[PDB]
UniProtKB/Swiss-Prot annotation:
Parent sequence residues shown: 3 to 126 of 244
Membrane listed as a keyword: yes
Additional remark text: Present with 3497 molecules/cell in log phase SD medium.
One GO molecular-function entry: protein-membrane adaptor activity
Taxonomy of the source species: Eukaryota, Fungi, Dikarya, Ascomycota, Saccharomycotina
Principal location class: endoplasmic reticulum
Keyword Transmembrane among UniProt keywords: yes
Keyword set, alphabetical order: Acetylation, Endoplasmic reticulum, Membrane, Nucleus, Phosphoprotein, Transmembrane, Transmembrane helix
Outcome, altering residue 38 to N: Disrupts binding to FFAT motif and causes OPI1 mislocalization
Function: Acts as an endoplasmic reticulum (ER) membrane anchor for cytoplasmic proteins via binding to the FFAT motif of targeted proteins. Regulates phospholipid biosynthesis by modulating the subcellular localization of the transcriptional repressor OPI1. Also contributes to the tethering of the ER to the plasma membrane.
Domain notes: The MSP domain is required for binding to the FFAT motif of target proteins.
This protein's name: Vesicle-associated membrane protein-associated protein SCS2
Membrane topology annotation: Single-pass type IV membrane protein
GO biological process, one term: phospholipid biosynthetic process
UniProt subcellular location: Endoplasmic reticulum membrane; Nucleus membrane
Amino acid sequence: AVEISPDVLVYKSPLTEQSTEYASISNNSDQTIAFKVKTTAPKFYCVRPNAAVVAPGETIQVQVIFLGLTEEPAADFKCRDKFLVITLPSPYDLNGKAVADVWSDLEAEFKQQAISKKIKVKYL
């Protein structure tokens, strides 16, 4: 129906510099969907777009821009950061409002019908 990928975002050393990895949401249903990407570590990543609609048959690629660390972490360190992607039906015209605007009502209505993915992060 709705496909969200990848399972893991892998950021490659030098982890002191910023780099971009990519997620993607494909709507293979026949109705428009809306999605929201939530970041557990907002000080270290910029997500763009962090909320949007996906028309039937469309794929939206989401840039996850890692801003970097002050020092290279230990080789054994396990990054615990995560990104939760939530997708919902979006059957109403937004009337020019943004998805982040209506997301409150949208989720309040269809939260039971949500399709979500927890995307992990791995430091390499």
